[PDB]
Design a protein around this ligand. Structure first.
Ligand code: 712
Length: 371
């Protein structure tokens, strides 16, 4: 394939975030940067921190331009403060371009950086609406598309227990079967609409408005599949019922307790598959993505310890790495849609595999979204 030099450009594996190398300033300073579709700021550690191996030294960059303005970014998890500026930025294993991008130099942070994660900054790939301080701070990908001829599209293959970020296109070696597209409802987060949920083929039978209450977003920088409280509770009762060939403590289903098995003995087969039906591109048409326990049970000697990685949220549905590790995911910004196909690297067994299937007939899907 023609995008071959972008294949395998992501690292992670320790399970603490997927990062790409980005080269900033002049002379070059290369740092490991978290690939984050749940936010819209490009920011790098710019001062020593106990969890950082390296950081951005602005004094050493001749092309750095201080915007003389501060920035504070609080996330769902963690927060940071820094200084705004612009500098030259390239991705040595991404597109063959260099852009002048907004960069936040992080000087202070709380519960943001992760010990042993090996990433030192974050690349917010969502839209300007959710950028801080405000939507006038052009996100990196917006700069890329305005300044170059790189097509307005990227795609992500996250390989769980690195992966690929293809910028400007799609690489067919990264997936099997067909790509299925769901509309981006609104360009702020990567917002989508979930129309039905099944556990082992059994409908959860909740009003679809509950699935997207507040919103449903795709976020490569969130570990879990996060579900609204009412949805989470129903899903857990259903998953418990379907996996009742063995029992687990209450706190396991809450993420508070881990269960471990002897190496290579995890009874994947006793846990159900989970299907999310997403709005399709044609009227009354949907498709479904199906994940295995290998996706939603995340590994933490001779002992294989796992955390249940479906959790509750009060800010709507978040399709994090639990979802993304099953699939090659196409963020087709030019056509305002997100595609899913079975990943060439998703973790599975000889009996079951992740799936993307359709089409299905689903009526009144427009009703499912929150206003
Ligand atoms: C970086 C790291 N991400 C996390 O640990 C993580 C991140 C968020 C909020 O995440 C967010 O608010 C942002 C938009 N992704 C920004 C961000 C905040 C902090 C760290 C990195 C990026 C929430 C949660 N949960 C509350 S949870 C346990 O329900 O998933 C877990 C990660 C990402 C992907 C992976 F495969 C593995 C680790």
């Amino acid at each position: 394939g023609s995008f071959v030099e972008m294949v395998d450009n992501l690292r992670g594996k320790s399970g603490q975030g997927y990062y790409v190398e980005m080269t900033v300033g002049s002379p070059p300073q290369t740092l490991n940067i978290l690939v984050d579709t749940g936010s819209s700021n490009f920011a790098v550690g710019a001062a020593p921190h106990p969890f950082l191996h390296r950081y951005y030294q602005r004094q050493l960059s001749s092309t750095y331009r201080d915007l003389r303005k501060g920035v504070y970014v609080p996330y769902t998890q963690g927060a940071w403060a820094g200084e705004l500026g612009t500098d030259l930025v390239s991705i040595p294993h991404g597109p063959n371009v260099t852009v002048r991008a907004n960069i936040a130099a992080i000087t202070e942070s709380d519960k943001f950086f992760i010990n042993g994660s090996n990433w030192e900054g974050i690349l917010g790939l969502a839209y300007a609406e959710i950028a801080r301080p405000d939507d006038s701070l052009e996100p990196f990908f917006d700069s890329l598309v305005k300044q170059t001829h790189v097509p307005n599209l990227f795609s992500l293959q996250l390989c769980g227990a690195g992966g690929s970020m293809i910028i400007g296109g799609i690489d067919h070696s990264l997936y099997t079967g067909s790509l299925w597209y769901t509309p981006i409802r609104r360009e702020w987060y990567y917002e989508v609409i979930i129309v039905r949920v099944e556990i082992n083929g059994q409908d959860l039978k909740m009003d679809c408005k509950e699935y997207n209450y507040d919103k449903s977003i795709v976020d490569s920088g969130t570990t879990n599949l996060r579900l609204p409280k009412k949805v989470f509770e129903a899903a857990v009762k259903s998953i418990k019922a379907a996996s009742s060939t063995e029992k687990f403590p209450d706190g396991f289903w809450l993420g508070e307790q881990l269960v471990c098995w002897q190496a290579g003995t995890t009874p994947w087969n006793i846990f159900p598959v989970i299907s999310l039906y997403l709005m399709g591109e044609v009227t009354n048409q949907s498709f479904r993505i199906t994940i295995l326990p290998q996706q939603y049970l995340r590994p933490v000697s001779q002992d294989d310890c796992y955390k249940f990685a479906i959790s509750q949220s009060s800010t709507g549905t978040v399709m994090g790495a639990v979802i993304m590790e099953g699939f090659y995911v196409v963020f087709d910004r030019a056509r305002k849609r997100i595609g899913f196909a079975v990943s060439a690297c998703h973790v599975h067994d000889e009996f079951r595999t992740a799936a993307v299937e359709g089409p299905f007939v689903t009526l009144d899907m427009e009703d499912c979204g929150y206003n």
